[PDB]
Design a protein around this ligand. Structure first.
Ligand SMILES: *CCCCCCOCCOCCNC(=O)c1c(F)c(F)c(C(=O)O)c(C2=C3C=CC(=[N+]4CCC4)C=C3[Si](C)(C)c3cc(N4CCC4)ccc32)c1F
Ligand SMILES: [Cl-]
Length: 293
């Protein structure tokens, strides 16, 4: 499993800030937009993009405040991410896209798709944000930690002061061990504690047990949209999962129209780090099937 990030930096001005993105593959055709979540960057896509790049343009931005993107003094609310990702997409002049989305990148992608349904030709998604009706529907092993994250004094001490999301939670969302080189790539954007705001706001935005109400509403609205939409869908899932346990993937594979589900074997949250060759190969082959009517 490759540790290298062999992609030239691309930058675009977005709302008076600069965002970093990977941009590889042919210039023409429908682009494939890859959206990472918490607490990763375009680095999470590094071993999946090589399967897609031969046939499609691959675009993998770093969310505002993350990766090699700028770090303005925001609260990094989901609303901030929405504002910046909307402006990113318009800044590149993207018309129709295929979405490949994960964790908070999936909340961005589904929310955008809902608002721009004629521009989304396909969605591949994994370990995505859905409402977690109660804390019992959150994995027991992660329950105490995410409950602690979702306070101001304790949460901010763990995530901002001690960097527990990067040093602890991240490696514990992968079944295989992350190497030191991989950890250093994930650490790089957050070496300065003041830049860790996004790592703390994100778990505080998770729609868990009806809170926060604004995120719960927005997430229910896109999961309704997704159940009504004929858009081609590709769902990767792992055992035991974190956001998406196997029973939920089984349910969505049937409830979502035009949905193919693929089992990656053992995984938790960062499925990309446990089976990148399967995810990359299935995306590439599924993209080809979008052109078979
Ligand atoms: C969008 C949704 C994203 C989900 C991504 C994450 O998926 C859920 C995974 O949740 C894991 C929750 N658990 C922890 O974060 C955690 C602990 F609760 C915990 F008690 C400990 C611990 O100290 O034992 C660790 C942990 C840490 C914690 C802190 C830390 N540092 C601060 C400076 C260094 C380092 C670690 Si490490 C990588 C040495 C570690 C290793 C293990 N194992 C089991 C075999 C090696 C276990 C825990 C920790 C937590 F990460
Ligand atoms: Cl999170």
């Amino acid at each position: 499993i490759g540790t290298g990030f062999p992609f030239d930096p691309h930058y675009v001005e977005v709302l008076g800030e600069r965002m970093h993105y990977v941009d590889v593959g042919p210039r023409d055709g429908t682009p494939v937009l890859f959206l990472h979540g918490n607490p990763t960057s375009s680095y999470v896509w590094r071993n999946i993009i090589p399967h897609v790049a031969p046939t499609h343009r691959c675009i993998a931005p770093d969310l505002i405040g993350m990766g090699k993107s700028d770090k303005p003094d925001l609260g990094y609310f989901f609303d901030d991410h929405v504002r910046f990702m909307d402006a990113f997409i318009e800044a590149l002049g993207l018309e129709e896209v295929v979405l490949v989305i994960h964790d908070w990148g999936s909340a961005l992608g589904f929310h955008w798709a809902k608002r721009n349904p004629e521009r989304v030709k396909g969605i591949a998604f994994m370990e995505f944000i859905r409402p977690i009706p109660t804390w019992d529907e959150w994995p027991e092993f992660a329950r105490e930690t995410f409950q602690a994250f979702r306070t101001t004094d304790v949460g901010r001490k763990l995530i901002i002061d001690q960097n527990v999301f990067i040093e602890g939670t991240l490696p514990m969302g992968v079944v295989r061990p992350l190497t030191e080189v991989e950890m250093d790539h994930y650490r790089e954007p957050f070496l300065n504690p003041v830049d860790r705001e996004p790592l703390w706001r994100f778990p505080n935005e998770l729609p868990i047990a009806g809170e926060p109400a604004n995120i719960v509403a927005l997430v229910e609205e896109y999961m309704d949209w997704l159940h009504q939409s004929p858009v081609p869908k590709l769902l990767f899932w792992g055992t035991p999962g974190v956001l998406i346990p196997p029973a939920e993937a089984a349910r969505l594979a049937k409830s979502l129209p035009n949905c193919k589900a693929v089992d990656i074997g053992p995984g938790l949250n960062l499925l990309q780090e446990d089976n990148p060759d399967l995810i990359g190969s299935e995306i590439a082959r599924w993209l080809s099937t979008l052109e078979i009517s």
